[PDB]
Design a protein around this ligand. Structure first.
Ligand code: HEC
Ligand code: HEC
Lengths: 128, 128
């Protein structure tokens, strides 16, 4: 569905920028930068879970050139990339469900598990 | 939560781009331009319905200034803008429901109802 590689890059960059903004607001609440607000937290969690479904489609073959932070390694080891992306989606979904209840510890763990997805993929597949 | 106004603009622009990609793919399948897949159509509908809840947050006061196609009129009649935005969210949710059926006439009309949301806001609140 992408006419040019720049379109696939823009698609996936846009999605991750939206992810990072919404995920960072949950982090701010859990880290104590701002008070925990259950209603906003749940919107943020719902948003990350839905947005997690988006960027994978942009990682098309032949889109490592130009203005992207994606490494060529993605396409050398695509099944591992895909495994990490799936695990991220599943972790984000689990965070959304945790955010529908009051148990704070369950939220904290789900957030942490999701965060470990970001870092695990970042470390292998994104430019420093 | 935006560090600078330009970030609010970039945020809403990114969300609309992802809406347009997903909405456009659905339209292409209804209009004979690529093969119809009901599962993909459905998940795109679900993407649109979730994404429709994202861009509103970016329409902060003052952010008619900058690299934006948002008209200052947004903030002259933010009630009407917000009514249009929530109606969009409602029409997108309805399209996602319709897409869980095989009633093609209802799906075509749900798609048209959602497209009317796009046009109605575009015509009033976005630069030509
Ligand atoms: C691989 C399975 C990833 C997971 C899980 C997450 N991210 Fe990531 N992210 C990844 C890549 C390969 C890229 C580069 C995309 C490109 O073409 O440049 C990124 C990018 C980001 C960005 C930058 C977006 C931009 O404005 O260009 C951010 C802010 C970002 N990623 C954040 C992020 C967070 C918070 C994640 C977990 C909630 C996360 N990513 C997961 C690969 C992967
Ligand atoms: C008002 C309630 C809107 C509705 C409903 C929809 N859109 Fe829109 N869109 C709106 C504005 C004011 C803007 C300008 C944003 C800015 O700061 O420039 C936009 C922009 C877009 C874009 C361009 C995004 C970009 O890359 O800059 C697209 C592709 C877009 N809008 C598409 C779109 C579609 C398909 C919609 C219905 C499914 C839709 N928009 C609804 C205002 C509103």
């Amino acid at each position: 569905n992408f006419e040019e590689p720049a379109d696939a890059i823009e698609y996936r960059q846009a999605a991750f920028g939206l992810i990072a903004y919404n995920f960072g607001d949950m982090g701010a609440m859990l880290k104590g930068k701002k008070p925990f607000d259950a209603a906003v937290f749940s919107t943020r969690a719902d948003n990350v879970a839905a947005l997690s479904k988006i960027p994978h489609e942009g990682f098309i073959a032949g889109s490592d050139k130009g203005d992207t932070e994606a490494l060529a390694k993605i396409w050398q080891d695509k099944a591992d990339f895909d495994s990490k992306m799936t695990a991220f989606q599943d972790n984000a979904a689990a965070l959304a469900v945790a955010a529908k209840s009051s148990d704070q510890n369950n939220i904290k763990q789900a957030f942490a598990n999701t965060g470990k997805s970001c870092k695990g993929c970042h470390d292998v597949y994104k430019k420093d």
